[PDB]
């Protein structure tokens, strides 16, 4: 049967157009900060602008908004943007993040019970082929790695692929994302830690928290296509999630494991707990987990397709 997203992505619509950043067709050889931000400017201007044009069409229904979202994505699609075989770790990291954001947003157009795309067949097909080509490329980018190398980058890659899988109806890509999810569930030790993110020393809590959104989104998407991943490695996802919340409350447990006082800069912002939306859709959340969900809504996370609250509701 055809791959589907969670119920929320079938939401009805409602219920000019700036010039498109030059499509990035270059080699993806970037610097991992002011330099980095500048090298990836057209990619950043794309991922934010397209997502916000989708968001605003889904809210407003105005038919110019749709035209503009599809002109933006189909320009990049038609041009073969981010397809290069010349890449470094940072450029392949950028390919998958951009796939992640744009496919996550376009999902709402693709599956809305309004059928916005019924009028835009050609441009829609240009965009789905582009996402499938990028999805096939991401798979190559993060395959044949030993456990020592499999970390947050592989998890977010697996989400970008899953998002692509459902948009393009590609079971090959679905299956890859589920396997990657399985590897990641197995990385979760008896205590709910990921050894590789324990290497991040003072950032190990932040990086543990950064792993939950991709993994929870993959579990949410797998479940609506009949693949329940909630009990993987004795409920590893729930084990990792619980452990992350004990840590954000009480830092000490991570300081004890890493021997290091934890930087709480990336546990500050509300966007960074958006994983509570798909997680509490999957697991019976306790009042400490539902309260953190209640007070920070509604979540906007570009990297997950924008309005995450609206699609888990």
Numbering used by the authors: 28 to 42, 49 to 65, 82 to 362
Task: Quote the original article.
The alg operon also encodes a periplasmic lyase, AlgL. Characterization of this enzyme in vitro demonstrated that it preferentially degrades nonacetylated polymannuronate (polyM) via a ß-elimination mechanism. The structure reveals that AlgL adopts an (α/α)5 toroid fold with five pairs of antiparallel α-helices. Our in vivo studies demonstrate that AlgL does not associate with other alginate biosynthetic proteins and functions as a periplasmic homeostasis enzyme to clear the periplasm of accumulated alginate to prevent cell lysis.
To investigate how the H202A and K66A active site mutants might affect enzymatic activity and account for the discrepancies between in vivo phenotypes and in vitro catalytic activities observed, we determined the structures of the AlgL H202A and K66A variants. K66A and Y259F retained approximately 1% and 30% catalytic efficiency, respectively, compared with WT. Although K66A retains enzymatic activity and the strain does not demonstrate an in vivo growth defect, some cells were observed to display aberrant cell membrane phenotypes by TEM. Comparison of the K66A variant with WT AlgL revealed that the two structures are highly similar with a Cα RMSD of 0.352 Å. However, residues 66 to 81 within the lid-loop region of K66A AlgL could not be built into the model, suggesting that the lid-loop region in this mutant is flexible. Similarly, we were unable to observe any corresponding density for the mannuronate substrate soaked into the crystal prior to data collection. K66 interacts with the sugar ligand and appears to contribute to loop enclosure in the WT enzyme. Mutation of K66 and the resulting flexibility of the lid-loop region suggest that K66 in AlgL is important for priming the enzyme for catalysis by locking the lid-loop in a closed conformation after substrate binding. This could explain the abnormal cellular morphology observed in vivo in the K66A strain and the reduced enzymatic efficiency of this mutant variant in vitro.
